[PDB]
Design a protein around this ligand. Structure first.
Ligand SMILES: [Mn+2]
Lengths: 376, 58
């Protein structure tokens, strides 16, 4: 993994600063081999090249000590200061990548406080990153990360910082488009549905310019999603239909299980069961083809709920599956869907019970953190 | 403060291995063992292999 390789390069650097030769050599070797077995991103390749150079500098500064009597040798700790002093630009760049990659690794480990701390250290080193497009890429990645951590305001703020830089270049309309997608998804979490739609629409027009099938489709899907979240089911249908058409014309297999799911569910909810069934059959098949584990179970769930009675025992297995996967947001939503199914059927005892399930799920620790070395 | 792997190198030194024998035992180049010792000896503040062995043992 790109994320794990960067963290190994981090460890390599810590051994280099200590002049621990065996350790640094072992990591250097393992890292070279791992990168020889992959097409690494440009950021990772550069970080490695920098560290390779820095490792050779370590050896170069050590070399004169070989011929020195011991008392004439400087303390390694001072050698290190000299290196950092005479190679200030290298060091700063290394600090930027070290912290960025450690932050990414911590995020991956779901260590959120730790990720933020490293992301901030990285940002303070951004001055060493000259290319303003590379800066925008950092802000863009911060935006995606805080979208994931649901620090919605910070996510929008970083998207704005990225957008401002992309706006000044002409060859980056695609990234600009994705900044709009970032604004939209954030608006969506804020329930600002019209604002989200409006940005998805902008993104759409841009993706159509760039003739980008995937983005075009996703954009259309997200609009349908917004409509669906407002329970405006009829209004969502045409957008889901258009998205599917786009995905299907090109052969974007990965996107299809999803594109078929909400529209299938909608037709169940609208009581359009023959149409539901056809969407279901197709969506289920696409999921089987792509080998999509999650969507297989979710299409299965639609049957369990809308056709099978409902089948509460199968629904329960599904709920447990989602939870084991930490798909809490979907789990809440599906429990609501079950509650609402029973509600319309005037089965209020069952509805109330699933509404209770919803609250239980909202009580789970979904993104817990840990303080670093704070005494209680 | 030696890493476990640096201690390992020193342990082989105490047993009387040559640099070449340490290299082979640890799958490192001899050159790397030389660098390692220069670093290790500096850290132990000693000026010889024999004397690194003594400070090691205390
Ligand atoms: Mn490669």
């Amino acid at each position: 993994s790109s994320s794990s390789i960067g963290e190994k390069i981090n460890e390599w650097y810590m051994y280099i600063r200590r002049f621990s030769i065996p350790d640094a050599e072992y990591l250097r070797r393992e890292i070279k081999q791992e990168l020889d077995q992959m097409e690494e991103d440009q950021d990772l390749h550069l970080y490695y090249s920098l560290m390779e150079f820095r490792h050779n500098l370590m050896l170069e500064y050590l070399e004169p000590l070989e011929k020195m009597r011991i008392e004439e040798q400087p303390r390694l700790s001072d050698l290190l200061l000299e290196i950092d002093k005479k190679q200030a630009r290298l060091t700063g760049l290394l600090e930027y990548y070290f912290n960025f990659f450690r932050g990414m690794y911590e995020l991956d480990q779901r260590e959120y406080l730790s990720a933020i701390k490293f992301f901030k250290k990285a940002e303070s080193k951004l001055i060493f990153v000259k290319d303003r497009i590379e800066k925008a890429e950092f802000f863009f990645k911060m935006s995606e990360s805080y979208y994931y951590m649901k620090q919605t305001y910070f996510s929008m703020d970083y998207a704005r910082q990225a957008y401002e830089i992309y706006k000044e270049h002409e060859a980056y309309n695609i990234r600009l488009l994705q900044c709009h997608s970032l604004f939209a998804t954030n608006f969506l979490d804020l329930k600002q549905y019209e604002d989200a739609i409006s940005h998805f629409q902008k993104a759409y027009s841009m993706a159509e310019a760039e003739k980008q099938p995937q983005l075009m489709g996703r954009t259309l899907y997200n609009i349908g999603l917004c409509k669906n979240s407002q329970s405006q089911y009829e209004d969502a249908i045409p957008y889901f239909k258009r998205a599917i058409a786009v995905f299907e014309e090109s052969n974007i297999l990965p996107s299809l299980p999803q594109a078929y799911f909400l529209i299938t569910q909608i037709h169940y909810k609208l009581g359009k069961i023959d149409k539901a069934h056809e969407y279901h059959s197709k969506g289920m098949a696409y999921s089987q083809k792509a080998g999509d584990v999650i969507y297989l179970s979710e299409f299965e769930f639609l049957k369990s709920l809308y056709l099978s009675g409902p089948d509460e025992e199968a629904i329960q297995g599904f709920f447990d599956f989602l939870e084991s996967k930490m798909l809490y947001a979907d789990l809440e939503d599906f429990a609501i869907d079950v509650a609402k199914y029973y509600h319309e059927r005037k089965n209020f005892q069952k509805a109330s019970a699933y509404f209770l399930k919803v609250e239980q799920v909202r009580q789970l620790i979904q993104g817990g953190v840990s303080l670093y070395e704070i005494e209680v | 403060v030696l890493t476990p792997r640096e201690c390992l190198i020193l342990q082989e030194v105490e047993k009387g291995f040559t640099n070449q024998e340490i290299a082979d035992a640890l799958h490192l180049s001899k050159r790397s063992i030389e660098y390692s010792l220069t670093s290790i000896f500096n850290k132990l503040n000693v000026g010889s292999r024999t004397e690194a062995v003594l400070i090691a043992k205390s």
